[PDB]
Scaffold this active site. Sequence first.
Site, short mmCIF file in Angstrom:
data_model
loop_
_atom_site.label_atom_id
_atom_site.label_comp_id
_atom_site.label_asym_id
_atom_site.label_seq_id
_atom_site.Cartn_x
_atom_site.Cartn_y
_atom_site.Cartn_z
CG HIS A 1 0.09 -57.78 -37.63
ND1 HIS A 1 0.61 -56.59 -37.16
CD2 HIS A 1 1.03 -58.30 -38.44
CE1 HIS A 1 1.79 -56.40 -37.69
NE2 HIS A 1 2.10 -57.45 -38.48
CG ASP B 1 -9.99 -53.36 -30.54
OD1 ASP B 1 -11.23 -53.14 -30.70
OD2 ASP B 1 -9.35 -52.99 -29.46
CG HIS C 1 -12.70 -48.79 -31.15
ND1 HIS C 1 -12.28 -47.52 -30.86
CD2 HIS C 1 -11.72 -49.62 -30.78
CE1 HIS C 1 -11.08 -47.61 -30.30
NE2 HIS C 1 -10.70 -48.87 -30.24
CG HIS D 1 -6.71 -50.13 -32.67
ND1 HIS D 1 -6.05 -50.97 -31.78
CD2 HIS D 1 -7.69 -49.56 -31.97
CE1 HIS D 1 -6.71 -50.89 -30.61
NE2 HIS D 1 -7.69 -50.03 -30.69
CB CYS D 2 -3.02 -54.02 -35.23
SG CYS D 2 -2.17 -55.54 -34.96
CG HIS E 1 1.42 -54.01 -33.61
ND1 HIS E 1 1.31 -54.96 -34.60
CD2 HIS E 1 2.46 -54.38 -32.82
CE1 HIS E 1 2.25 -55.86 -34.36
NE2 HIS E 1 2.96 -55.53 -33.31
CG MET F 1 -0.55 -51.92 -37.81
SD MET F 1 -0.28 -53.66 -37.81
CE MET F 1 -1.62 -54.34 -38.78
CG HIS G 1 -9.53 -24.96 -38.08
ND1 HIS G 1 -10.50 -24.15 -37.62
CD2 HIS G 1 -8.79 -24.22 -38.93
CE1 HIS G 1 -10.43 -22.98 -38.18
NE2 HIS G 1 -9.37 -22.96 -38.98
CD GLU H 1 -13.58 -21.31 -33.11
OE1 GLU H 1 -12.71 -20.50 -33.56
OE2 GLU H 1 -14.20 -21.06 -32.04
CB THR H 2 -11.39 -26.07 -33.70
OG1 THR H 2 -10.79 -25.05 -34.55
CG2 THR H 2 -10.38 -27.09 -33.32
CG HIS I 1 -6.50 -24.50 -35.00
ND1 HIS I 1 -5.78 -23.62 -34.21
CD2 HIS I 1 -6.92 -23.75 -36.02
CE1 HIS I 1 -5.82 -22.42 -34.74
NE2 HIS I 1 -6.51 -22.44 -35.86
CU LIG Z 1 -0.21 -55.22 -35.91
CU LIG Z 2 -9.05 -49.46 -29.35
CU LIG Z 3 -7.01 -20.86 -36.97
#
Ligand SMILES: [Cu+2]
Ligand SMILES: [Cu+2]
Ligand SMILES: [Cu+2]
Lengths: 336, 336, 336
Positions: free
Chosen positions: C89, C92, C94, C129-130, C139, C144, C249, C273-274, C300
Amino acid sequence: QDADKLPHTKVTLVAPPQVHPHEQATKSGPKVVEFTMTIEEKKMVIDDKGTTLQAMTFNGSMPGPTLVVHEGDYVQLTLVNPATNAMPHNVDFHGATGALGGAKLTNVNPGEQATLRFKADRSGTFVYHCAPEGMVPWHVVSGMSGTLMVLPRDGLKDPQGKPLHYDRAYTIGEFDLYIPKGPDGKYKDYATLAESYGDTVQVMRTLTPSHIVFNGKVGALTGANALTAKVGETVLLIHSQANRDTRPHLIGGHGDWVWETGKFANPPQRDLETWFIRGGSAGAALYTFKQPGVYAYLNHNLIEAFELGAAGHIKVEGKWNDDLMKQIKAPAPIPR
Amino acid sequence: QDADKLPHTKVTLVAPPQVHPHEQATKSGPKVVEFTMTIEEKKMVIDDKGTTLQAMTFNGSMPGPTLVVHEGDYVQLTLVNPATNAMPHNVDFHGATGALGGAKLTNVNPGEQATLRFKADRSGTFVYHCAPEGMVPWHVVSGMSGTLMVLPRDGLKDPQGKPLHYDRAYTIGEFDLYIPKGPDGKYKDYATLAESYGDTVQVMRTLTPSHIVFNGKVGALTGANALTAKVGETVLLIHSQANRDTRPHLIGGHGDWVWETGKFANPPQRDLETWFIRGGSAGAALYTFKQPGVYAYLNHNLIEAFELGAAGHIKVEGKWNDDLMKQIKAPAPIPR
Amino acid sequence: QDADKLPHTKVTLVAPPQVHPHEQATKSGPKVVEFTMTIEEKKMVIDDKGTTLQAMTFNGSMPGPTLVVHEGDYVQLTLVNPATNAMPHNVDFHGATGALGGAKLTNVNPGEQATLRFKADRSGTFVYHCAPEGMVPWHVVSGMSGTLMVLPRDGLKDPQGKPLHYDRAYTIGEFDLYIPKGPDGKYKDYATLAESYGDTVQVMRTLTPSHIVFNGKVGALTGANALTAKVGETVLLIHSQANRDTRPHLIGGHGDWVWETGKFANPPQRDLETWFIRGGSAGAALYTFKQPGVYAYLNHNLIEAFELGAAGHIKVEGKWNDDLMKQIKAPAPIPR
Ligand SMILES: [Cu+2]
Ligand SMILES: [Cu+2]
Ligand SMILES: [Cu+2]
Ligand SMILES: [Cu+2]
Ligand SMILES: [Cu+2]
Ligand SMILES: [Cu+2]
């Protein structure tokens, strides 16, 4: 103000793609705006080869009609489920606050009606849709959605606060359909709405629509039924998608000002080629036509548009403008 | 000004991922900028196991070349369809106004050419693509798209109006491919472009690409063909997707300033991890490299990137910066 | 400042959907904030019919815990891969700059740990994330991922620079799962993680999830495990999707202020709303509850929510407000 003490007004809805008459900027104070919608389950032909959908609609159309109020108004909707229908229904207004958008207060079995009031305290275009417990996606994908537009009381504004005004509004509801096929490779035609359920759910779960239509059918907004405008006219294009993302585009045009998330207190973006309507939302675009001709208005996944149905036409009258675009040399043999 | 009276200039296009030389801010007045592109249909190997695509290109590449002008210029494109091709073609510029983006004025059968002028009156990155009636998605998904970049005449600006400048521009076109398989489970290889059509349309309608590639092939922008930069350099990454959404991301970097909808009159967003290019659009991101190494630039549906092909590399030279990132303890046995 | 000379502090992480205690606005200067996470591979039951996932987690949960720092802090993570695991593993971030987000500096085989420091120089919610070479999507889709939240040192702000404050934060990680089926139509149950790989990759490549879950299972955030709030409370809803787009939503609510791209130096949008979380990102929404009841918080695409699992509940205590919403007439027979 207490809505119990406000003036009431009734609006007569109109069928899509039109939008009922309304003011943009208004001098009116807040009102309780009364609407009625009647649910209609019906079988609809959705394509050019006879495919049918066991559909479910507000007011007989896909989408349901657009309801327009101003911020600070109250929406007071009577929802009617005639005894000729088979299923229970309700309504969830994304523009509303509480009770699952109103769905918990509007469960109507066939033979019943209910009346809901809510404050339209947020400006924007908002989806409304049916949402009966245990069968929410089925009702939505079968046709039960439309738009509530809550205009700012002083009308639409650009990022600098300049007034925007439109001459005409159109409402486009885009519907991802999940029509089952049988073992012979043909779409199924069902005698009743209930008979369509299990097979449809299985198709839904593939997340691959059989058809993606504007306003109820492939080609709904074409031919005699094309949208219309003139050079010089500003149009508001309201686009709703209650279940699945779409990416509207006007071929040969732009979104001059676009609220892709649909909420008018946020500044719009300008000059868009293609915008994005998140599934479960409505957005709005303004465009002022500058060239005549037949435009396409479509979902710019071009497979979704041209193969599956998510495209319509706007026929625009007026004078061609060679400053904006000119054919310098027509198609002709390649020079030697 | 009347374009008939403006100065004309010719630009020589360059192949992706480079972008032809251009100014950002300019003192020049508006010009008619003349370009030529020649359509080439050809069979291309698109992956490492020999799969072929019956492709269709502007100027021999996927994407077509990026065309750069400034706002208020006119684009005057000669589109050439040699007699060695089999299909008719045209061009739809999302940056243009009228006539289905120019498609109605540029229908060229094999052996023909046409010349279109339009005003580039809106700043931004805009898709252009082929769109022949009755086979629009097929031409697009087969490779016929690229970007028009219309720079503001005073260059790019941040939300406060501060100047942004880039040292290098790269153009990435991302193509969702729909390569049919036969009954033996192998991708089909077709002798002619026309022979591929029916089978491809069926795959298209599943909405599931077989491959999603940058710049024409799995791994196109890797190895000898990786993008390059140096620590301290600001790069503009133009990303086009004419048919399907994508979500670009620079692994170990950011979008310092991003116009994900691609329209430079709108303020950009800063510090993005991943941005969103709506199908049917081009967007643009600026990044100033601060660390050396081999970056990946990819669509952050990681299945689309690593399994289907939508990933490239940027090899960056320079000095490692331990303030930004430091390995405190290298991988070693877990302390007892 | 040089991080080698800054004060260090250790944070104890908490399991989702909670977020460890933290300040919003702070008077503190920059610190090196030390965290530890221990990878756990385990088989998890993900639905109500006994389907299992050969899962991979940070700290035993899907998502991994949310790590909260302030802009200008340094994150110093010890990543532990116990010898009871089978796979290598890494991580990363961001939010980090360089070395593939830290992945190149954190490759840990079973029995190893590593410690990475990076400057959290950009405010926002960011996925971590891995990403082990050659098996990145597997992964991620196996569980992950989680969120790093880097708060502005003076707290969250609206577009005008007004302070926003939340009373409670919840973290929702949404996971598109790709569980294989066998020839009998039943989901497969594997004895080991490695045995699941080939079959899973084939499902991944269809781009169609079998399940889409919040926080590790269908219904994870329902029943005893519903999120909670009170009328009057402002909640921050952090939503991460490391691989695939989603559209959050709140049914019966709104996003009062939303950073859908998740980066707090950009102005938020109001009244959504969303909203839209691009695959490979985390975003954040604030909402102040104004009505009691059981809300749903969902993706949604209603098929993804109700059929595939991407929905949870928020149980809110307090007083009903008839100004916001009132049932005028309960469901009753249609007037004659
Ligand atoms: Cu992993
Ligand atoms: Cu990434
Ligand atoms: Cu709705
Ligand atoms: Cu219904
Ligand atoms: Cu073509
Ligand atoms: Cu187009």
